[PDB]
Structures are given as structure tokens and as C-alpha cells.
Amino acid sequence: VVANYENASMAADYIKRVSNVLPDIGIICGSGLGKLIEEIEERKVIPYINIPNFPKTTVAGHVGNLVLGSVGGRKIVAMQGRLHMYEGYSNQEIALPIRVMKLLGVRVLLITNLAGGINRKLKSGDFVLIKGHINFPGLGLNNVLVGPNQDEFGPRFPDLSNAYDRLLQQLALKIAQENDFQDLVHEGVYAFNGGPTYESPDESNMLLKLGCDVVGMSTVPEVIIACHCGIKVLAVSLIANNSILDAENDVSINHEKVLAVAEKRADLLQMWFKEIITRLP
Amino acid sequence: VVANYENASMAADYIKRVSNVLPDIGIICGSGLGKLIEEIEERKVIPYINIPNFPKTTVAGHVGNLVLGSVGGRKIVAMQGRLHMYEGYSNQEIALPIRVMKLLGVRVLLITNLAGGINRKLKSGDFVLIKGHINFPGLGLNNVLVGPNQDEFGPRFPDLSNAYDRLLQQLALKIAQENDFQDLVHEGVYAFNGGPTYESPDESNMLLKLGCDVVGMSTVPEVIIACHCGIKVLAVSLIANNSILDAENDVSINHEKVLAVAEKRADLLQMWFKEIITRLP
Amino acid sequence: VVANYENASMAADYIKRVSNVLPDIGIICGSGLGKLIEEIEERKVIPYINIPNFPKTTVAGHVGNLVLGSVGGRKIVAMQGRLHMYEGYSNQEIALPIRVMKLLGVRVLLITNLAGGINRKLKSGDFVLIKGHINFPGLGLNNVLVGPNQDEFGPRFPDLSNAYDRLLQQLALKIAQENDFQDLVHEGVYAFNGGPTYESPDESNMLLKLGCDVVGMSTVPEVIIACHCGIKVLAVSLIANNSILDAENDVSINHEKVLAVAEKRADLLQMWFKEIITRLP
């Protein structure tokens, strides 16, 4: 199934009939960082498997719902269970839910992820406002836009220089200052490691040489599809560990340690993003 | 359809019957840089769609012809509408037209493209003689030769150290000097960005650190197929912008600005390449 | 055919019936470096084509056998004819023979390859104990683990920081010292070039900047599948040439020169690895 205008329209038609909500904000939440979705008001939960043309997700299993409703007086749509390219999903499967968001009316997309720190100023539990990226799959002929262009959504050759909206970064920081946790908030350049293996110690050292501040396995595909079709983006990484320190000390990382950092910061990130949604222009 | 000896031979048989031209020079021209093809003498235009085993190009659309005839007394074959890997074409689809050129008798392939400048000496409207490359798809398991080797055309493990013929670079420069536009002509290393998104500002900064002089989304696949089967190559980039300056000043690039630079230099590039063809040993 | 638990089990059942050998050591030998396999005692040769669910290898041709028997009193299984990803094999085809080794009882995997030198201390004929890697396909969404996770074998997100066992490196060096050829033995970081073209001169220069000591087209996929399922690894590169010196002097590399270096060191590498196998804890 191609992520074209006709197919995205069929999915949006189904959703509109079921939910009655017309959202102008979309959210995609990182693993362990999804509690805000359970607090959406007057909500409607729609399993992916019920939506025409949505990608099949049963091989990987686990949760996969679209959730619509209200947060802070604003109308939103959330992806509960996000699709990652290291699972083997195609470019078309990743893109279609974002293009459905566009047809539903979404103008702003807020994204969180879990990442490794490369910059020596970054500690476990810090947040990074993403200001730019280094897309190793894209340089290497695995960009999410490889294929025919879908002209109704955007141009053949997108410019990504303003993919991460500057005013949304400023608003996120302002709210951190109001609540006295600005000491946790940095900005930086995100390296996309296709995954699913964590960056090796020598890959971490390479990324330091190349000007990367953080590294992770998600987010850049969604950012590119959003930018292509004119949706503004705020993306925030939660730092689980510093990969450069771990390489110097011969210390391992694993998914259990990552999820424990997510639990440690989940409630603060929930409160922060509720207020960002409330305050969006 | 595999780019093997039998399939390429069937396409060459059809072409020979229709054109009567036996070329020893091939040309592939960048977007907006194709006017020379309309000036081929006593020419024959053959739509791709009519040639046995040529790749299907109707999803992307636009022009796609092989053109045979004479330029400056020399017999040539041109691709009018080139195939780019960011459109989703496979390794086999890219390779077959070049291997058909080989079977038709081509010994020299001349290529132009549009590119971004990384080296700080490069300005919009400059030309770069390509002397080597950094192939990010090739390092990342998307080399155009991934697959079975077609032994009739070349070896399993090609050496690319002399892929860009030194004497052809010298001839191109000599002609620029004769016409007093040598101040526009540089040499440099080409980085292949698979595309179709322009390099991000932070990817540009990375490419500067890594010794790249220019960046673009084409050319390296064709160069590798040509070198594999013993065809000499001259490749010239037209610089549309300097990506490093644009990153420092927060200035965007887009396809409209690129095509306007092509129009500005099209007639000079036409004259230059007509004389290169005339003067080839 | 997916490299899952059921399919690997069917292949292991066939092998056990035919060979009666229960190995705890596996070996994969580089091109020209396979003579040890012909000296396995009381051996059993099993063509891949006869084993249920083994990948089809007839397009590439050449030898492809599993060989079981005894070396130095130890029970081993060898791959005679290894699968390389530049031939077009999928992730699933590469992984299944290693997962069969696991089900047969393999706890240690010994690997050799032919490689290019990047570090200026490396000469033709030197050996490099691999201590870490830079996986360009993995960064670029062509990691051997892209796809569904096979949970019975290992975790969704592996840590590769101890993929190259430190005590096995120490044992290999100790044996070199006992036989007075330690002057040939280095340690270093391996860059995976997907291939099949040799690294270009400008790619070599880039790899020097990025902290790579050697470059080659194999090994990292097998290491990752082994680490995922808890198999310890020793990997040794034979240096055929120094790519950085060749770039400064404009000297070519080719497969004939590579195989001649293999022949020059084959008997010493055979003796070394026979003793490593004998001495494994």
C-alpha cells in the first residue's frame, strides 16, 4: 500500500466518521513516555488494525492505537505505539499515518524519544531540544522519501533547514524556566542510527568527531515526512546515558536501564508537554 | 529484469536496427543542461518505452528517450531523461542502459550534474571537474553493484582509483583556458547523498570535516557501472549554491533556485562540451 | 525463509542425524585461508544445498559446504564458502547458518578475513586482532538485525561493547609470542564497507580521519548475529595492502594481489588457528 493521496484519504474518512474530533496538533511519544495519552479528555481509541490502509503491525505485536480527544482545551491526535524502521517497515508504511494527520488538519507535531548522549555536557536524565540532524540512512540511499514523489503532499526535493521550528524550541525552554527545571534542558544535533543495535563504542567516538550531540534510532523519518507536507515540528530527546563516558569506562547500556530512566522522568515530561500543548500559538 | 549480457544484447539489437549509428561516445546531461541533445545532427530519437528490457519510467513520468547521431563529426548516444536512484529504481534498472552503451561501442562517457558547494572557494555558477568521490550508499550496502556479478562486463571487485580519467580533465581545462573562462573551473571530491532531501545544514558541516568539496544526488552509480566495464569517464558539476555559507547565514535552497543557475550557464556548458567531443583523442 | 527458531531447528535436526558430531566451536575462513578445513579429522562434508532451509547459493556458484569433525581434540563446525552481503543475500540468509551453529552447541566463533590497512603502522602481510568496529550499513538502515526480532535467540536492542572477547585476543597474542611472530600482530578498529568496490582513495582518507585502522567487506554481520545469541567471537584480519599509502602514490589494488598475499600467509595462519582451537579454555 503506497502512502498516496487516495489511500491516506480513505483512512482519514474512516477516522472522521468514528471520532468527530478535528485535531490541529499531533503527538508521537517515546517508549515509557506515553502516560499523557491516557489522560486525553473525551477520547476515542482506534486500533490501527481497524483503519483502512494502516500498516500491518502484528508481527512485532504490542499496542498500536490512534487516540483522539482534548488536552488543555486543544484538539489532538496521538499515535500509541509508534512504527520504527529497524522493525522492517517500508518508507510507505512509516509515511502514511503522518500524511493522514495532515489530511485530518494537523499543523504542529510534537515528538519525544530516548537517546544516547555524545556531547560531554550531557548526563542521564537530561533533555535535548533537537535543532538539526545527521541522517545516515538518508545519505546512504535509505531516506524515507526514496520512491516516487507524492506531489499532493510536497515537493520532490525538500529543504530541511527549518524542519525544527525555532519558536517552538523557545516556548519549550520558557516553560522549563517557569517551573525551574531549565538546568536539565540543552539543545543539540541528533544523529540517526538506523538500529537496532546500540552504537558501538567506536561509532560513538566517530560521532563525537562529526559534531553530533545525541544519537538514537527514531524520529528523523517522521520529521522528514512532516516537513515535506508543511507540518511544524518540536522534537525532544531524553538522555538515557552518555555513550562517550561509557566507552572510556567500558560500561554497557541495555534496554532495561533505558526504561528505568524513562520512568524517572515520565511525570515531568508529561507535565511539560501538557503545558506546551496548552500554550501553542 | 536483470542487467545481464543477454538482456542488454536484446536492447542493443533493437537500437542498431533502428538507428544505423555506431557511437563511441556517450553523454548523460543534468537537469536544465540538455540543450546539446537537441542539436545532435542527423539524429534518431528512441523512447525508452519502445526498447526491449529498458526500465519502466511511467510512475515518475517526464521525458525518457535515447538519442543517436553526430556532434562535431563524432558519433554519439545520449540519455534524454536520466534515471536517479532516489526515485526507487533498482541497481539493475540503473545499470542496463550503461551496459547497452558498452555493447553499442561506447568507449568514453561524459556526464554533467547540479551540485552543492562545500569547499569555501566554490561559488554559485562555478564548474567542478570531479577527481574522486565519497560514496555513502556504497559504504552502507546500497552500492549499485550489490548483487550477482555479471562477469561478461567486469570483475567482482572493481578498483575505482582511476575512474575519473586524468587526461580528459586536462582536455576540459585546456578548452576553458582557450575561451578565457578558466576562472570558473575547479577540481574536487564529490560526495554522493542518496537524496531526495537536500543535505541538512549539519550534514553540510560534517561533509566539510570529511574532505568533501561538492555534494549531489546523482552520477556516482553511473560512474561505477562505466568503470566496471572499462568505459572512461569525465564528470563535471555545476555549483548551484554553497551549502556551508547558507548554513552560517540561515539561507534556504530549493529546486527553483537550482534550475535558474542551470539556465544561467546552459549555453556555455553546451559550447564547452561540443568542443570536448570534437577534440576527444 | 526467515531465520527463526523453527526453521533453524529443522536444519540442525538434519545435520545432527548425518554427522553425529556435537561441536562447541565454529569457524568461518576468509578467501584463500581455508586449508585448515581440509585437515579436519574424521570429518563430514554436507553441501548447503542438501540442508533444509539453508540459503540458495547457485547464482554466485562456487563451493558451499558445512564441515564437521575434530581439530586438536576439539569438536568443530566450519562454513566452507561464506555468504557475503554484497552478493545480494538478505539479512535472513546471512543469519540462519549462525543460528544453526548456536542450536548445534557452538559457544565460540573464530573468523578470518582479508582487509585493507588504514593505520600507517600496517603493512601487507600483517595480522590485526579486531577490538571494535564502525558499521556503516548499520548506521544507514542496513544492519543485519533490521526486521522482526527473533526473541528465542536474543534481545531486540543488543549491546556490542563486548562483541570481541578480550581473553581470546590475549590468547591469540600469547601463541604468536610463543612462535616468535608477534612482530606481525596488531590490534585495531574495523570499518565495514558494504562493497563490492574497493574503498576509493578519498574514502580511505575519510576513514583515517574517523579513527579506522582497517577496512573490509565482511565479518561484521556474522559478529552481530553471534553477539545477539551469546556466542563469543575472535576476528582476525590479514592486511593485503595499505590503502592510505596507495592513495598517496597512485597505486591500484585488485583481487589477484589480494589472493597472492593470502597464499603467502596461509600456512602460518593455519598453524596459529589450530593452536588457538587446541588451547581454548
C-beta atoms of A160 and B200 within 8 A: yes
Cα–Cα distance between A212 and A206 in angstroms, integer?
A: 9
C-beta atoms of B139 and C59 within 8 A: no
Contact predicate B74/B278, CB 8 Å:
yes
Helix (H, G, I), strand (E, B) or coil at B117: strand
As a whole number of angstroms, the longest Cα–Cα distance in chain C is: 56
The count of other CB atoms within 10 Å of the CB of residue C151 is 10
**Nearest in space to A193 (alpha carbons), one of A178, A208, A203:** A203
The Cβ-side half-sphere exposure at A123, using a 13 Å CA radius, reads 4
Q: Does A18 contact chain B (CB < 8 Å)?
A: no
Q: At A173, phi and psi to the nearest 5?
A: -65, -45
Tell me if the bond preceding C52 is cis, omega within 30° of 0.
Answer: no
Cα–Cα distance between A83 and A187 in angstroms, integer?
A: 25
Torsion angle, CA of C111/C117/C118/C119, rounded to 10 degrees?
90
The count of other CB atoms within 10 Å of the CB of residue B41 is 10
Contact predicate A215/A118, CB 8 Å:
yes
Cα–Cα distance between B217 and B82 in angstroms, integer?
A: 12
DSSP β-bridge partners for residue B115: B239
Method: X-ray
- What is residue C60's DSSP assignment? T
Instruction: Give chain B positions within 8 Å (CB) of C246.
Output: 161
Smallest Cβ–Cβ distance between C141 and the set A85, A252, A255 belongs to: A85
Is C62 marked as binding a ligand?
Answer: no
H or E stretch covering C86: none
Select the residue from A142, A203, A212 to test the C interface by mutation, using most C Cβ atoms within 10 A: A203
- Distance of CA A177 to CAs A33, A185, A261, A265, B259, Å? 21, 9, 22, 17, 46
Exposure letters C90-129 (e unless 16+ CB within 10 A, then b):
ebbbbbbbbbbbbbbbbebbbbbbbbbbbbeebebebbbb
Cα–Cα distance between A158 and B253 in angstroms, integer?
A: 9
Is C84 marked as binding a ligand?
Answer: no
Cα–Cα distance between C234 and C273 in angstroms, integer?
A: 11
List the chains bordering chain A where 3 or more Cβ pairs fall under 8 Å: B, C
Cα–Cα distance between C85 and B27 in angstroms, integer?
A: 32
What DSSP letter does each residue of B230-279 carry, written as one string?
Answer: T-EEEEEEEEEEEHHHHHHHT----HHHHHHHHHHHHHHHHHHHHHHHHH
> What residue type is assigned to position A79 of the chain?
M
Torsion angle, CA of C152/C153/C155/C158, rounded to 10 degrees?
180
Q: At C253, phi and psi to the nearest 5?
A: -120, 150
Helix (H, G, I), strand (E, B) or coil at B44: strand
Closest-CA distance of chain B to residue A90, Å: 12
Contact predicate A33/A269, CB 8 Å:
yes
Instruction: Give chain C positions within 8 Å (CB) of B155.
Output: 254-255
Q: Does A134 contact chain B (CB < 8 Å)?
A: yes
Is C198 marked as binding a ligand?
Answer: yes
Is A256 marked as binding a ligand?
Answer: no
Closest-CA distance of chain C to residue A194, Å: 4
C-beta atoms of C255 and B146 within 8 A: no
> What residue type is assigned to position B123 of the chain?
K
Rounded to the nearest 5 percent, the helix, strand and coil shares of chain B are 40, 25, 35
Angle at Cα B45 formed by Cα B41 and Cα B47, nearest 5°? 160
Torsion angle, CA of A107/A108/A113/A119, rounded to 10 degrees?
120
Domain range for A213 is 1-281
Q: Does C162 contact chain A (CB < 8 Å)?
A: yes
Select the residue from B133, B141, B223 to test the C interface by mutation, using most C Cβ atoms within 10 A: B141
Cα–Cα distance between A103 and B114 in angstroms, integer?
A: 34
- Distance of CA A190 to CAs A135, A170, A259, C56, Å? 8, 18, 20, 40
Contact predicate B20/B13, CB 8 Å:
no
Torsion angle, CA of A7/A77/A281/B253, rounded to 10 degrees?
-40
Instruction: Give chain A positions within 8 Å (CB) of B91.
Output: none
C-beta atoms of A143 and B86 within 8 A: yes
H or E stretch covering C71: strand C65-71
Helix (H, G, I), strand (E, B) or coil at B36: helix
What DSSP letter does each residue of chain A carry, written as one string?
Answer: ----HHHHHHHHHHHHHHH----SEEEE--TT--GGGGG-EEEEEEEGGGSTTPPP-TTT-S--EEEEEEETTEEEEEEES---GGGT--HHHHHHHHHHHHHHT--EEEEEEEEEE-STT--TT-EEEEEEEEEHHHHTT--TT-SS--TTT--SS---TTSB-HHHHHHHHHHHHHTT-GGGEEEEEEEE---SSPPPHHHHHHHHHTT-SEEESSSHHHHHHHHHTT-EEEEEEEEEEEHHHHHHHT----HHHHHHHHHHHHHHHHHHHHHHHHH--
CATH classification of the domain holding B153 = 3.40.50.1580
Smallest Cβ–Cβ distance between C211 and the set A137, A141, A206 belongs to: A206
Closest-CA distance of chain A to residue C47, Å: 31
Instruction: Give chain A positions within 8 Å (CB) of C162.
Output: 252
C-beta atoms of A197 and C224 within 8 A: yes
Through-space distance between the first and last CA atoms of chain B, rounded to whole angstroms: 36
Instruction: Give chain B positions within 8 Å (CB) of C139.
Output: 140
Interface of B with A in 53-112 (CB under 8 A): 59-60, 85-88
Exposure letters C17-33 (e unless 16+ CB within 10 A, then b):
eebebebebbbbbbbbb
List the chains bordering chain C where 3 or more Cβ pairs fall under 8 Å: A, B
Parallel, antiparallel, or unpaired: how do β-strands A74-80 and B74-80 relate?
Answer: unpaired
DSSP β-bridge partners for residue B44: B68
Is A199 marked as binding a ligand?
Answer: yes
Joined together, the cell numbers standing for residue C130 give: 579486531
The Cβ-side half-sphere exposure at C58, using a 13 Å CA radius, reads 3
Closest-CA distance of chain B to residue C139, Å: 8
- Distance of CA A86 to CAs A57, A73, B25, B119, C145, Å? 13, 36, 44, 34, 8
Select the residue from A128, A136, A139, A227 to test the B interface by mutation, using most B Cβ atoms within 10 A: A139
Exposure letters B163-197 (e unless 16+ CB within 10 A, then b):
bbbeebbebbeebbeeeeeeeebbebbbbbbbbbb
List the chains bordering chain B where 3 or more Cβ pairs fall under 8 Å: A, C
Instruction: Give chain A positions within 8 Å (CB) of B200.
Output: 132-135, 160-161, 163
Closest-CA residue of A relative to C145 is: A196
Which amino acids of B are annotated as binding site for hypoxanthine, given as ranges?
199, 241
Instruction: Give chain B positions within 8 Å (CB) of A209.
Output: 209
Closest-CA residue of B relative to C59 is: B148
Look at chain A and report how many structural domains it folds into. 1
Name the E strands within chain B: 25-28, 41-47, 65-71, 74-80, 108-117, 127-135, 185-192, 214-216, 232-242
Smallest Cβ–Cβ distance between A194 and the set C139, C156, C189 belongs to: C139
